[PDB]
Every structure is written in structure tokens, then in C-alpha cells.
RNA sequence: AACGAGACUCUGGCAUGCUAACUAGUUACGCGACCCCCGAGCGGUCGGCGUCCCCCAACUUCUUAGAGGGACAAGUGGCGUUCAGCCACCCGAGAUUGAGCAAUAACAGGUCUGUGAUGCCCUUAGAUGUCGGGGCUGCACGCGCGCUACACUGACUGGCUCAGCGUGUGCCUACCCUACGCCGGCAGGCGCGGGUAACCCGUUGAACCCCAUUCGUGAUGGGGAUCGGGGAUUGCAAUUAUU
């Protein structure tokens, strides 16, 4: 508090969680603030140990895929500093509040699975863990920007920051909020 | 200051400028026909490359105890793409670096010192630290 | 014999052999060894090496 | 005269080596020649990694062999006579010894 | 007496021996200021203990560090781990227990292996595949 | 791939729009100028450098692979 | 600004004013990117602007500095051809003359009827390469 | 009761304890010398930056290698027949870091082209045992292991900055690793010097990474296949292009 750490420009207070079903699986402000999203980390060796490391750190981790960006985590932090910068200018909100909203609006609430009966495909609708919601929601919105910048004049920074605006709002003009409702649309059917 | 106390990306780009201002250096004939290292695919983007490389040369002599033409090349060498074949390391040109060191030595900021190898002249060490404080005075480190 | 009975071999495969059977190709040159890999194994225990890892 | 004489030991067996080093440090200390203890040098690895099959067939397997030599050296400064006296005594196992004329 | 206590840091082969000697200010690493050390994107990280603890634990020391080993990243964690640990040891030994006990509690709150060394190191390649656990493709028929 | 073409020299309308986009835009990058106009990305790079010399826009961040510009900090 | 001109024709190939000067010139055969960044600097002009921004006075000088490279002190080793063979000099060959020169050397190696011309005429690889699993195309299988 | 299992051996993670170091370092000054006011101050003096200078200085944290110690489900709380154990937690480095070695019995598995290991059969002077030059690379197809790419999370050009396992002439019948100086755009040539190696090459100043220019979504500068012309090095010889 009298030694409160920012991101080097952003407050980690004034960050809400608008679920009681996803608070304490978002890590952003209990003492999870850090100036960077790089650490040695422990993300393994016990099942309940992933939820104890920041959301901002998780974000940096999950956007380094496709076989040529692995082992280039340092380049990834470059993309995150521009992302938040653009988000703050663009709408005016503290860009962490943007990200938390974006996660909460994108998480699917029911999903389907397989079951083998009579040698024919039957499907069953099931619910999801809070830990599952977070894992899915971080994956989905990152997939949008990764796809978009794959032959465009637009850079990966621009694409990613745009995608967090439309996710944080209920706009439904994003790769995340599209696919979220697609899954639920299946789950209704084979319920 | 010591050159360590200031930024070094900034140091060289001002040390190069110092030389080019003062009419310093003797420059080879070849300067628009030069690949500037074996592994490079194209000629320099800059015509002032002789001045630029002399900056980086003189900086290293301050730091390490100084060594011959071989070691200078080893500092400069990088990765060589081989097309379909996978990459390898290589060490660049020699005759460019041998002219760089000899041009500096012409101003007597370098000299073949003890144990057969170049070392930076005490007059040379003076001039580095002279503009080293100008960098910190100018902007502010 | 006369002026033909031989052709210079002083580099490459035909100018080295091995000391336990004079076999070529599969052999270990390293450390001054000159032993063919099939036979090297059988004299491995005999002062030389021992397995440890 | 008193010459700085360096006795290098080298072997393949760490037990057999070390006790013979202790003996040579003893014989020196007995006559108070102001010897320096062992300076144990980095152990070096000879490796041979080759096929286990004669005439390839079956899964590809290899086998790491290693021999570890050991070097260590004791520095003496004393007359060269009494050195060659104490050197030649109390050595039984296969362990090599190398006597040096002088050192700086 | 002559106040000097030495520590080291580790992270996957990268030693950084940091002596803490009485003084005031003037912390360095490799005879350079730690206000720039050159990836400088992870610049906030090595500064992190100094910034978080304030300048009032660094109100009577010069700490200087020599390094070797590791890559660009692992060096940053080594130097950070060493200067942090240096500070703790210095207060335990020439000041008092309750001096360092506070400071120990502060660091271990936001622990990031600031008082311990990462055990993890690389595992050996065994044949029949690249890497230490991956295997070449296996074709049936 | 698609077929598209961009303008590699300036015209009247490009310059005039360039002066009037400034108070209306919070973000200005060369990429966004590529889309709103029909203009090449390196042309658009230098076009924004001109505006900064006038003081119409303000730099806020810089990189090798990106440059960001803002309005006049008037909201 | 600078609306003056765009796409133009020079010797034997049409060169756009759309692209940067050096890279624009490369389309002409016998001139690579490496060959052009030299010749522009001997001509002492910018390479930091478009090819449509050059004037007629300037481009007239370009072709002269190109086609007499030894006389403007570009080294001999930096040319396409050193002692062509049976012509006796260092030479630099450009677009439509390149093809004519090339077709001669093919004809020559079937004139003497070396191994080379036979491989050329049969449509098989000249250099040491396997053709067992290479080339394909193909079809007609058993 | 026995074998295999574990035990064992090697390897990795823990010691400011022990043993001792010009073929390993550090610290401390003495410094004298260079350097800049670079910091307090003034430029003196005091301090900072490294090198030569360092010692019959002090030390062994860092490097090295030997003996030892440390880890046990030990402690606590649950759970279990309250047994064998299991789960969580404290302490702290969690009892599980990775390999080596590996049974009985079997296969008509592979290898007579490793063997001066070997049975039998065959051939043996017009020889299946030697020289010359040619082939094992020959291409309508098919299949397998890989390598490089399809770009902007990029390429290109400058600038900044970090390692580890090894290896090396004195060997077979003849050969090594290379610093340094000079000449050449480059490949390379040439003159001198060290190293039997914790001593010399080499404080192995490696790459991705990092920072700033240029290119602009275009089969484009992405890609470098194919192919023309020319220069070097190895060898007795390079043609089907050794590199």
C-alpha cells in the first residue's frame, strides 16, 4: 500500500471481479502485482498451483505459439507493453479492468463431450470448472489476434489490443465472443 | 567519466561523429564495392561505415587488453544463412579491419604494444574519456 | 618387384588397418587407437575402459 | 643445492593414487622440507560411444564407456638427492611418478 | 573492523559473487551502473529489490558484483539474487538479528527465489531421439 | 493472396485529410493511415513524421516495429 | 507531392516508378540488387526515394555508368563475365544480349559435343545431381 | 529357501564445516604509472574505472577434489484392521533428478562381408589371391528418414551483449591445434611464435535474443531451386561439375 507496485504505469487496485464464481481464480491484486510478467514460476508439480500466478503472466505465456515463437518470451513482453498502452488511450479505462471483463465475458458456461452408446455418436452436455473457464477464455481471445496479423499491414500489438476492447464489451464483434456462443448453442441442443 | 558509466550504443555513434568532424582517418579506396563481412548478402546502408567501425574498434580496446586482427574479426562474425542447408557461424573480412586499426594507429590512438598485438595509446585513452563525459553532460545518464 | 606392383596409398582408407585382424572400416582412430569396432568391444574390459554410465 | 622440485603423480585409481601421495607428503614432512600439500587437478574424461550390434539390425543402441584419469602434484623445495631417496620408497601399486629438474 | 561479507547467486549455472562492503550508494555490477544493463527490457527486475525496500537499507553500503556463466536472462536472476542476499547477511553479522529479520520478511513475501537457488538444471540427451525426452518418428510398413 | 494497390505519392486530398484527422483521432499509426486513405505504409510512415514537426500530433511510444501517436492531450 | 511521372520504359524492360530506385532497376536482367546499390553510388544519387522521381538527365547518366563499369572504377571481379571465352575481355551483359550470349554457350558445347551439350539436349541435369528421385513430372506409371 | 524386484554403482540437487592451492582465485593495501574531474572538493587531497606493478602479504566465499555430514514417512494433523500404508501440512533441498547393471525359457530373428572363431562343400595357375580403366550417382514410377520454406511475432543493414561438453603435432609407414605481423574485396597466400596441454590456441568476447535504420501485404527484397561466366584450396589426378 505505501509501497504499492504498478506495472510501471498502471494501478492494480480499482480492479473488480464481477463474479463470485471466478474471484480467487483471477489473480491480480491480493499480492500478485509485479512490475513485469516474467518470473521463474511454478506452474506445475501440483494441480492447484496454476491459479496462484498472475493473469498478466499467464497472458504472456499463452501467446508464443506456432513453432517459431517458442523461446522468445522476451519479444512477447514487448507486445504486452504496447497492448495495454493502446487499450488505455483507446477507451480510457485502466487496461487491467479491460482484461478482467474480457475474461469474464468470454468464458463458456456449458460444453459438450462424447459418449459411446450403441456404436453411434451421442453427445452429452456438461458444465465446467472455474479453472476451466479461465484457461479457455485466455486461449480464445489470443487466437483472434494471432490469426489476424498473419498477412496484414497491422502489427500483432494493434490486433491484440483491438480484440480486448470488443471482448471487454458485450459487442459480439470478436473471435472470442463469437465462438463462446457457438459452444453454448451446441450445449442447448444435445442437452 | 569512464566509458562504462555511459550508454555504449550512444557512445560509438558520437565517437564516429568526432572523427568525421576533425578530418581524421585515412580511408581505403574500396568503399562502394565492399560487402563488409563474408556472411553479409549486401553492401552497407551507410557510406560512413569506415568511421562507424573505427568507433566500435576503439571502444573494445579500452575494455579488453587488445589483440590482433584475428580477434577483431571474431567479435564481428555472426550467423551465415546457407539457403537450403542449415546455418553456420563464420568470421567476416580481414582486410577491412586491418585498415581500420592501421588508420587509428596513423593518428596514434592505437599502437602495436607489448607482446605483439595492438593496444590503445595513453593519448587514445585520454580522448575516449574526454568525449565520454560529454555524452553524460549532454543528455543525462 | 619391377616398376609396377603398387600404387601410392598413404592417405584414405586403404593405408590404415587394425592390429587385431587387419580389417578396415568400422575402426576407432582416436587416442592413437587402431582397432576395429567389433573387436574393440571384446578387448574393452582389457585395460581400456569400463562401463559406468 | 636446494632446488624447487615438483613431483607430479598420475594414475587411474583414486584410492591407490591418494595413499601414495600421502606417503610422499609424509617423507617430506618427516625431514621438515616445507612441502606443499596436494593440488588436485581436474579429472579428465576419455569417452567412446559406439554401436552394441555387429552389423546393423534391430533397434539403435549405443554404449557410453568412460575412463577417468587423475592428476595431482606436490611441490617440494629441498636438495635433489634426498628427494630421489624419499621418492623411490614406499610405492607398491601401479601409479606413475615424474620428477622435475627445477621450477620457478 | 573491515566490514566485508560475500555472497553468491545461482540460476542454472551462473555465479554472481557480490561482496557487501561498508560505504554508501555506488552499487555496481561488472564495473558498470545497474541503471542500464543490456537487455534493458528486464530492467525493472534487477531494480526490483532496491525499489521495493527503499533506499534506506542501502544507506550505508557499496555492493559490487562480478559475474560469469549463463545466458542474458539467467545472469539477471543471478545478480538480483546475490545483491538481495548480500544485504541480509551484512545486517545479520555486524548490526543485529532484528535488523535483518524485517528485511528477510519483506523479500520472502514476494519470493521469486530471492533467498534460495533454483535446483533445476538440464537433463542429458540419451540416444534414439533428439533432446532429452523426444523420439524420432517410427514408421510401420 | 488478394490484389490491391496503394498510392506511393501524395495528392491534394491526402494532405488535406491529413490535417483534419488529427483532432478526431486518438490513435494514429501508419497502419491506420493505410486503411483510412489508400496509401502505402512507408509513405504513411513519413507522412506522420511531417505532422510531428508541426506539433499537431504527439509521440507516446516508439519501437523498431511500431510507432504510436496521440492527439493533443485535450481528451 | 511530386506527381510528375510514374511508370516509364528504359532499355528492354519496362520499369515502374512505384518502387524504390535500386529495387526497381533489378527487373532488368544481368542486374541484381547487389549490382545496383554500387552503380547508384558511383552515380552519386539518392537511393532513398522512388524511381519515378528521377529526371531524364539523371537516368541518362545511369546507363553510361552501368555499361562502362571498368571506366568508372567498378572492379573486374564484380562483373558478370571475366574473359567470356574467345572474346578476350571482361564484359558486363544486360537484358536481351544476355540471352543471346547464353544460347551461344549451349550451342558451343554441342558443337564440340562434350558431356555438357548432350545433357542439355536430352533435358537432364548438367551438374552432379541424382535424377532417380528428382524432377518427377511424371505420370505414366507401371 | 533361491533368482529377478529393491538393495548396489554412476550422475544431479544441499555445506562460508574439514583438507590446500604461482598449471586456481579473491581480498587487502603498498603502490608507482595511465586516465577523466569522473564523484565530495578545486584541477590539490580523498574516492571511483581497469592494466602493468604486486609481496618472503592475508585469505580460500567464488574455481578445483578428497574424506565426511544431510532425507528417515522423520515430525504434525487426518485416514486405514489402526496393521501394512495412504493424503494434506510444518521444518527444509521432500522421502520419486536421470542413467548403468538386469532372471528363467524362447526365436529355425540378424551377422560365414569383424574374427588367423569354425564344420562341410566349392575353386585353385587360362586363379575367386595383383596393376590400368569403368561402375556402386545410371531414370516413364512408387515408398521411408530428414533439411529449408511459404513472411511483418518477418527479412535486411548497422550498433550493443551473455556459455558449456571437448579436442590438439611428438601417433602407422608422417601427421596437429593455432596466436601474432604483412599482402589480397573474397576464397586465400606469406613471414614469425607458443602448446605433450587448470600452463598454449581460449577470460573459447557463439547463436537465437536485444536496440535503431530500410522494405509494405505485393509470388514482394518472401523462397533460392535451377543455371551461365570467373577466381581459390586439397590430391597423383576433381571430366558425371570434391569443397
TrEMBL record, chain D:
One of its GO terms (molecular function) is RNA binding. It is found in: Cytoplasm. One of its GO terms (cellular component) is small ribosomal subunit. Residues 6-100 form the Small ribosomal subunit protein uS10 domain. Pfam families: Ribosomal_S10 (PF00338). Keywords: Cytoplasm, Ribonucleoprotein, Ribosomal protein. InterPro entries: Ribosomal_uS10 (IPR001848), Ribosomal_uS10_CS (IPR018268), Ribosomal_uS10_dom (IPR027486), Ribosomal_uS10_dom_sf (IPR036838), Ribosomal_uS10_euk/arc (IPR005729). Its main location: cytoplasm. One of its GO terms (biological process) is translation. Component of the 40S small ribosomal subunit. Component of the small ribosomal subunit. The ribosome is a large ribonucleoprotein complex responsible for the synthesis of proteins in the cell. Belongs to the universal ribosomal protein uS10 family. HAMAP family: Ribosomal_uS10 (MF_00508). This is Small ribosomal subunit protein uS10. It comes from Oryctolagus cuniculus. The lineage of its organism: Eukaryota, Metazoa, Chordata, Craniata, Vertebrata.
